[PDB]
Amino acid sequence: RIEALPPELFQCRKLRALHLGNNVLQSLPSRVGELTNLTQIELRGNRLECL
Amino acid sequence: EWTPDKLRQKLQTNAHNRLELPLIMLSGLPDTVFEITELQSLKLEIIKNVM
Numbered sequence A: 001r002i003e004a005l006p007p008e009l010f011q012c013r014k015l016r017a018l019h020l021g022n023n024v025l026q027s028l029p030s031r032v033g034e035l036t037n038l039t040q041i042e043l044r045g046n047r048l049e050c051l
Numbered sequence B: 001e002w003t004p005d006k007l008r009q010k011l012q013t014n015a016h017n018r019l020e021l022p023l024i025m026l027s028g029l030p031d032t033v034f035e036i037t038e039l040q041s042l043k044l045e046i047i048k049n050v051m
Helices: A009-010 A030-034 B004-010 B031-035
Strands: A017-019 A041-043 B019-026 B041-045
Touching: A009 A030, B004 B019, B004 B031
Parallel strands: A017 A041, B019 B041
Antiparallel strands: none
């Protein structure tokens, strides 16, 4: 039960596998563009308005 | 005809992020399907006269 993704999550750059699916994330912040090591991210379901 | 390894091959995901077994136009339901215990979703398509 996570409603909003904190920017401090994206402050780390070493994230590789983000199992964020099936949540109540209102939206994914654009700060995910900082992440480079991210090779897979689970975004199915949720309350994701747009990618 | 349906070894558990064939069911491992058949294993996939669905629209709700569950472990799906797509069974298509089968004569029935094998007990080998129920031998799999990691299964999260069952897909039975036009498999009639099944108990």
